[PDB]
Subunit: 622 residues, 3 copies
C-alpha cells in the first residue's frame, strides 16, 4: 500500500528526532545525513539522555532545539586544532617528558627523518600550571625515528603529560618577523594551503605576549593565495618572530538555536559557530574563529566556570548572556574568557558564583594566561557587565587582565580589578559599595565611582574617580591609596614605582577618620584640578616612602597636605587674573594674605582682610 | 484502515491538524484553551497559521505556561493574559467594599471568614477588579498580618492595614513567615528553617515592614528572590538582596515556570504577569504589560499603542533581566505616564529603546521613556540598572520633558539623546553621553551623581556631592530665562528622605557657547560650596558670567575661562596648591592682573606694578613694588 | 477512496507538497513569483528547503511584501530585489537624453508629453538605466515642478531643472502638493487639507526647495514621514521632522508595507528599496543594499562581500531604525567607498559593527565603516543617530583612514576602536571611548563637539567651540611629523556653510606620553582663542611643549603640567579666578617661579625673591621685596 508508506513518511519526517529513546548510533547517523545536506536536525519535545553517553562529532552540526526539548547529555563538536597525517598517543607522565625532552618512547617508524613533528598534551590529560603547560603545542623536526623511539631536533619548550606526537598535514617554519597589523605573509604556501583554510601562527622568538613572554599564537583565515604569499581576512593581532605556520582543520560552521535546553555544549575548533537563544547549563567554546554567541542563559553544573570562551580569533560577538551556578576551589569565574582578541562583548549578567576555600570564583573574568600561553586580549570592545559579589572569602567580582587597545564601558554591581592592561579606556565604572583595584596599568584611562580605590604601580595613566567611603582592611581609612607596582605589562620589566599618573579624586566620605589620598612608591604623581574632599576628613594628602616630583594643580582639598621641597606646582603663560579687591583677590601665602589695594599698593596681613587697610596690615610696596 | 488500527481519516485529520497547531480563525475560546492546556502538559509551543484571530472578542487568560509561535501573517486580535500567583494562596475571600469603607488602619472586614483560623497569617491585596488610587497611596499594595478573630460575618486583623484598600481581597498564604531582625542588602543567605514550605526553585517575596531602604527613606518596598539551596539552617538565593529589610515577611509566590511569545507576528494585547523567566521577542505587540516577573528577557519588540496612557510597561521585574531593541509609540495620557514605562526593575540591562509619538491631553506629560520608583504605596529603588542607548522625541504635550529617570541608585546610564531629559532623586550613579542640544537638561535632588554631555541649557535643583560637566549651546526661554546653567533649591535627599533645600559640594564645569547678548552663563542660588571648576568657558558676547543669588555660601573657584562679570564678595574661596605656580614668562606673558594693577617680575628681578597691561619691562606708568 | 469531499490522494499530495514551502531547486522564476504573490495575499512567509537555488540565473524582483524564511542549508544564489515606489506615479515617460542634452536649468525636454496637462505637477528622476554622475552633482536627485507647455514632441517645465539629468524620466505624481511657508524641524503637524490624496499609514516625501538646513547650509535635502492622523485641517506624522523645510513639496510615496528575510541561511544579493518597516535578521548576505526605507530593523548579519566597492550599505533610511551585530568584509574599490556604508540615516541606532578586509586599488580609500551625508545632489544631515561599538582595521590601501563619520548632528557616539578614525563636518555631538592607540586621530570642521579617547597622535583642522580630551602615545610621521597634537586651518562651518579657516574657542586637554626626544606636544596654528586646559601633561624627554605657528590669537592657558619649551608672546591670556589662590606652604613649597626669580612669603611675613629656588627662608642670594 502506497498510502500506508506515504502516511508513515509524513508521520516520521527525516531530520526530525522525536523519540527520546533513539540510540546513540542512530542519532549519529541522523547527524551525518544532515551534514551531507548542510541542514538542521530538529527535535520534538522530551527529555533526551542518550544512554548517558557523550555525543561527539567532528563535522558540522546544526541543531534546532525547541522549547520543551532538553538534550541532557554532552554534545561536543570538535574540529582539528592542527590537521594531522598520523599521531602516536602516549602514557608518559610529565616527569618522564620534562621540559627540554628530545627523546620520546613509542612506535615512530612512519615518522620520516627531517619531517615536521608536533607535540600536544594527550586528550585524556589537562596538564598542569605547576610546570606551565595546560594547553601547549610544540613543533620541531624529526632528527631520528625507530619503532622504539623518536628524537626531536629541538627540546620541548615545556613538560608534557601523556604527550601525543604527530605529523602535521602542512606546517612550515617562517624565517623573519610577521609584524602585528599586517595582512600579507610572504612565501610560497600553494602546496599546502587554499583560500578559506584557517592557519595557526605559533610564535617562537618574538616577545609580543603579555609581560613580554614568548608563548603566544593566533589563528587567521586565508582570503587570497598565490606563489608570492597569502593574504588573511583579518590583520595579525600579534608580532611573531620565526613562527611556525600550521594548517588547522576547523569544522566549517555549526549552529545551535531554538529556545530549548542543553545540559552541556562544547564547541571546539569550529570556523564561524553560532549559539543563540538556548538555555545551556554548561557552555564551552574554544579554538574557534568568528564566533557569534548570544541570548544564552546558563544555570551551571557546579563546575568552576559555567560559560567559557578560550582562544577565539577573528571578529566575534558575545551578547545578552546570563551565567550562574559555578563552584570553585581555585580561581575561576562563572563567565570566563581567555585570550579572545577582537571580540565585541555586550550585556553580560553573571551571578551566583561560589568559592569553597581561599581563592575566588568571579562573576566575569577576562584572562590572558592559559599556561603556557600569554596571548593579549587585543582590541576587545566590552560594554555592559552587571555583577554581584561572589559567595567567597574573595570579594573581587569582575577581573580584566591582559587587555590592550580595548574600549571598556558600563561595568557595575560589585568589585572590579583591572590588572596588567595597556592603552585602554575603562569608563562608566559604577561600583559605589566596593573597592576598585587597579594594578600595573600602562597608558590607561579609568573613570567612574566606587567606595574606595587602590592603585598599585601604573604608568602614564589617569584615574578620574568619585569615591564615597574609605577602606576597611589593607586600605584602612583611605579613600584612594597608591602603592608599588610589580611589572610593566607590555615590556615585562620588573618595576615597582608608578610614574606620571594623574589623580582627579572627589572623596565624599563624611568619616572623621578619612584620609583622601595616601600615596607611596610613585614618581611624578599629578594631583589634578578635579580633586575635592570635605572638611570633616582627617587628612587630604599623605605622602609616604619613595614619592618624587609630586605635582599639584590648584584644587579643592580641605585638610592636611604633606610638605616638602620636591612639590611641583602648575605652570602657565599669561599670568593669572586675581579678579577682585581685598574681599576676593586676597592670596593666602604661608602665614599672610597678600592683595593689591585700591590705591595700587601691594599689602599683606596675617589674617584675612576685612577692609583694604586693616590694623594688622603692612604695605609691601611701593 | 492502517497497520496500527487507525483509519485513514484519523491519520490525515491528524496530519492536517496537529494538536499543537492552530490554523482555524474560528476556533472557539474553549477549544483554544484545550490546545494550550495540552501544549503545557508537554512543555511545548502552540503555533498559529496565518489569519486574523479574534477569539469571539474574549480575553484569553491562563495561569500556566504559555509558549506561542505567532508567525508573520498571524494577528492575535484579543487580549492574552498569562497570570501566575503573586502570592500562593490556600483560600481567598473577595469583597465589594470601597476604599472609604476600608480605610488605612482598618482591622475589621466584613465577610464569611469562618475558615480563617485565629493566629494564622492573613494577607490583604487590592482585588484584581480595581487599580486602587494614588490619592490614598495604594495602587499596588500588599499587607500581611495575623488573624486576631474570625467568624462567618467578619475578620479581625492583628494590625491595621497600612493603606486604604478598594475591593480588598483577604487570603491565607500557602507559606508565609515573619522574620525577626535585619536582612541586609547584598546578602544571599536567609537564616531559619523554611523546609516545611520552600523548595529549591521556588520564588519568594520579601516584604519590608520596619526598614527605611526605600526611595526617600520610605518603608514600603519589597523584592522577589529565587531559592537556590535550602537546608534546615536557612535558604540561599540565586541573586543577592537589592534592599535592606527589617522584620520583613517572607512569602511563597506561585510564579508560572516560564512562558514565551515569539515568531514575527502581531498581538493586540499581551500581559505577562507573575512569570518566572518570561521571554517575549521579535513580535509586534500593540499593548504589552510585563509585571511581577523574574529574570525577564524582552526584546526586538515594536508597539504601535492602543491609545492608552502607556504602550509598553515593565513593573516589579526582579533578578537579572534584559530589555533591548524596543520601538514603542502611540500612547495618549491625561495624567503623567509614558509610551515606554518601567517601575522598580532593579538589576535590569536596557539597551537601544526608541520611543516616539507620545501625547498628553492636559497639563501633565506623556513621556517617551520613564523609569519610576514610585508605584503607590511602594518606593522600591531601581538599584543597579545598566541603561544604554535611548533615543526620544518631544511629546505632543504642554510638557516638553521626554525622558525621565527617577529613583535610580548605583546605575550606569549612557547615550541618551534627542529630547529633554529629567534626572530626579537618583544616587551614586553615572549619566554620560547625554546629547540633547535643542533641549533643557533638568536635574533635581541627585546625590553623588556624575552628569555629562551637552544640551541647550540646564537647571540644577538641590543635589549633593555631584559633578555637572556640560557643554551648553543656548539659554533658557521661560523659568530659566536667559541663563545657560541655573542652580536653585532642592527638596529632599533621595536616600535619607531628609527635607533639604540647599545643594552642597556640587562641581560645575560648564562650557557655554550661546552668542546671545542676553546670556548669563551661571546663575547660582541656594547652594553651599558650589565649585566652579577649571573646565568653565564662555564667550565675551555674554551679558554676565556668574550671578550669585540668595543663600550661596563658600562659593569656590579654580582658575577658569569665563569672560564677563562675576559677582563679588568676601565669601569666595579660591583653589589651593603646593609648589606655588610657575608664571613662565616676562612682562609680556607673566603679568598677573590683580585688582586694578598688572604685577610682574622684571628682567632685573624687581617686582613692578602698572595700572595698564605693560608693553615694555619699564612702562612710564610702572612702579617698583620692591627689589 | 474519499474523505469528506477530497480524495485521499489529494490530501496526501497536499501534505507531501505544502504550498508555501519551496523545496525544489528547479522551481522556475515564474512559479516562484506565483508562490510569492500567493503568500502576499495571506501576508505569510515563503519558506525554503535545503539546497542551492539559482533561479535560472535571473534577478527575482517584486514590488509587494516579501517575507522569506531562508534556513541553514538554503543558499539563494541570485539577486532578490524588493522595490516599492519612491514616488507613486500615474504616468511616466522615459528618455535616452544625455546629461549634456539635459543640463542644469533645462526647461524643455523632447518626447511625447501630450498626456501631461498644463499646470499639473511633473517630476523628473534619473532613468533606471543610469547612475548619474557626481561630476554634475546628480546620482540620486528628484525634481518637482509644474507643466508650462506640453505636446507630442516636447514638454516645457515651469522651472529649470536643479541639476543635469542623464536619461531623465518625466512623470506625473499620484499626489504632490506645494507647501507655502516653513515646516520647522521638530514639528509634527503639517497644516492644510490633504484628505483628497493621503490616508493614515501613508508615507510622504518632504522635498526642500528654499530652506538651508542641509549639511554646509545646502538646499538639497528631503525626508520621509508616516501619516499617523489626518483631518481636514492638517496631517500629523508619527515621528517629528528631522529638518527644516521652506516651500517644500509634499509627495505621496508607494513604499511596500513590510517585508522580512530571516532564518539562518545565505543570500547572494538582497536589495530592499522603498519598504515601510523591513526586517533583515540572522542571515548571511554577500551583498546587502537597503535604501529609501522607513523604520528599518537589520541585525545579526554577516556579509563576505562580492568584491564591489561596498558590501553592506544603507541609504536614505528614515523614522526610527536599528542596525546591530553586523560583520561585513570583502569590498574592493577604486574611488572612496566602504565595506559598511551609510548615507543619510537620521535617527538610526547602530550597535556593534565589526567590518574588516576592505581594499582599494588607487589613491582613494575603501573604509571599514563610513557614515556620509552627501549623496549627490543631497546633503541630508545624519541627525540624531546613536552609534556604539564599532571595531575596525586598517584598509588594504594607500589610505590608512578606516572609520569616517561625516555630517552628524545631535549624535551620541561611543566605543570606536581598532584603526584610524576621521570625524568631519559634525555639529553638537559627543564622541567618546575612542581607542585607536596605534593610529592618527583626524578631526576636521567640528562645531560644538566633545571628542575623548586615546590615539597615537592627533590632528585638529579648524573646529569651533569643541573640546579635545585626549591621551596620545606617539607623534606623527608624515604631514604631522614629530607632533603629538597638531592644530591647523579649517575649511567650512558645518551648519552655516560659511567658509572659515580659523578654528575658535577650542579646548585642548592633551596628555602626551611619547618618549621621543623629537616630540612636540602641541603645535598650534590658525586658531583663535585655543584654550590649553589644566589636564595637559607631557614628559621632559620631549623637544618642545607648545609651538605657536601663524595666525594664533588670544591663546589661553590654565595652570598645567607641560614640561618643555612654550612659545612666548604678549597675546597669552591666563586663567581667571575669584578668591585668590592659597599657596599653601613656606619657602620650600610655596615658592612662586616668576620670570627669573622665585618669590615667596617668608616666615616673618615679608615678601622675598631669589634667582634660584631657595634652600632656606633666608638664602644669601635673596632680596626682601618688602615687609
Amino acid at each position: 500500500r502506497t498510502i500506508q508508506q506515504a502516511i508513515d513518511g509524513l508521520e516520521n519526517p527525516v531530520h526530525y528526532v522525536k523519540d527520546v529513546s533513539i540510540t546513540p548510533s542512530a542519532l549519529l547517523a541522523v547527524a551525518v545525513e544532515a551534514a551531507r545536506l548542510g541542514r538542521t536536525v530538529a527535535f520534538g519535545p522530551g527529555h533526551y539522555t542518550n544512554q548517558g553517553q557523550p555525543f561527539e562529532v567532528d563535522f558540522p552540526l546544526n541543531l534546532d532545539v525547541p522549547v520543551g526539548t532538553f538534550l541532557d547529555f554532552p554534545i561536543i563538536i570538535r574540529g582539528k586544532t592542527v590537521k594531522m597525517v598520523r599521531s602516536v598517543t602516549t602514557n608518559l607522565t610529565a616527569a618522564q617528558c620534562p621540559a627540554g625532552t628530545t627523546v620520546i618512547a613509542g612506535d615512530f617508524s612512519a615518522f620520516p627523518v627531517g619531517s615536521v613533528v608536533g607535540v600536544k598534551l594527550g586528550d585524556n590529560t589537562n596538564g598542569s600550571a605547576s610546570y606551565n603547560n595546560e594547553a601547549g603545542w610544540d613543533f620541531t623536526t624529526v632528527a631520528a625515528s625507530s619503532n622504539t623511539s623518536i628524537t626531536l631536533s629541538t627540546g620541548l619548550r615545556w613538560a608534557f603529560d601523556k604527550p601525543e606526537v604527530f605529523t602535521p598535514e602542512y606546517a612550515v617554519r617562517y624565517s623573519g618577523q610577521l609584524s602585528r597589523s599586517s595582512y600579507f605573509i610572504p612565501g610560497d604556501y600553494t602546496s599546502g594551503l587554499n583560500v578559506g583554510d584557517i592557519i595557526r601562527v605559533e610564535n617562537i622568538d618574538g616577545t609580543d605576549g603579555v609581560h613580554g613572554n614568548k608563548e603566544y599564537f593566533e589563528m587567521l583565515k586565508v582570503s587570497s593565495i598565490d606563489s608570492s604569499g597569502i593574504t588573511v581576512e583579518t590583520r595579525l593581532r600579534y608580532t611573531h618572530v620565526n613562527p611556525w605556520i600550521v594548517k588547522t582543520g576547523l569544522v566549517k560552521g555549526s549552529s545551535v538555536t531554538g529556545g530549548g535546553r542543553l545540559k552541556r555544549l562544547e564547541v571546539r575548533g569550529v570556523d564561524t559557530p553560532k549559539v543563540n537563544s538556548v538555555d545551556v547549563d554548561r557552555l564551552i567554546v574554544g579554538l574557534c574563529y568568528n564566533i557569534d554567541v548570544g541570548e544564552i542563559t546558563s544555570r551551571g553544573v557546579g563546575e568552576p566556570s559555567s560559560v567559557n570562551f578560550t582562544f577565539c580569533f577573528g571578529r566575534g560577538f558575545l551578547y545578552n548572556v546570563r551565567a550562574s551556578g559555578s563552584v570553585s576551589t581555585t580561581d575561576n569565574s562563572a563567565l570566563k574568557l581567555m585570550s579572545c582578541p577582537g571580540l565585541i562583548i555586550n550585556n553580560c549578567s553573571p551571578h551566583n558564583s561560589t568559592s569553597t576555600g581561599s581563592q575566588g570564583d568571579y562573576g566575569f573574568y577576562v584572562d590572558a594566561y592559559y599556561s603556557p600561553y600569554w596571548c593579549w586580549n587585543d582590541g576587545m570592545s566590552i560594554n555592559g557587565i552587571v555583577t554581584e559579589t561572589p559567595r567567597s572569602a574573595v570579594t573581587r567580582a569582575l577581573w580584566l587582565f591582559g587587555l590592550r587597545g580595548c574600549s571598556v564601558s558600563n561595568l557595575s554591581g560589585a568589585q572590579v580589578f583591572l590588572q596588567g592592561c595597556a592603552k585602554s579606556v575603562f569608563s562608566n565604572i559604577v561600583t559605589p559599595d566596593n573597592l576598585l583595584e587597579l594594578r600595573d596599568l600602562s597608558g590607561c584611562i579609568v573613570s567612574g565611582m566606587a567606595n574606595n580605590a587602590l592603585v598599585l604601580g601604573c604608568w602614564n595613566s589617569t584615574f578620574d574617580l568619585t569615591l564615597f567611603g574609605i577602606g576597611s582592611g589593607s586600605n584602612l581609612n583611605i579613600a584612594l591609596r597608591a602603592g608599588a607596582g610589580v611589572t610593566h605589562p607590555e615590556t615585562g620589566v620588573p618595576t615597582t614605582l608608578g610614574k606620571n599618573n594623574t589623580f582627579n579624586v572627589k572623596s565624599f566620605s563624611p568619616s572623621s577618620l578619612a584620609v583622601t589620598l595616601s600615596i607611596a612608591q610613585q614618581e611624578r604623581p599629578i594631583f589634578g584640578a578635579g580633586c575635592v574632599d570635605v572638611d570633616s576628613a582627617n587628612k587630604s594628602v599623605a605622602l609616604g616612602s619613595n614619592v618624587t616630583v609630586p605635582t599639584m594643580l590648584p584644587l579643592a582639598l580641605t585638610k592636611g597636605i604633606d610638605s616638602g621641597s620636591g612639590w611641583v606646582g602648575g605652570r602657565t603663560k599669561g599670568g593669572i587674573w586675581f579678579d577682585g579687591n581685598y574681599r576676593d583677590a586676597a592670596v593666602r601665602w604661608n602665614g599672610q594674605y597678600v592683595w593689591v589695594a585700591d590705591n595700587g599698593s601691594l599689602k599683606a596681613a596675617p589674617t584675612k582682610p576685612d577692609s583694604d587697610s586693616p590694623s594688622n596690615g603692612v604695605v609691601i610696596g611701593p
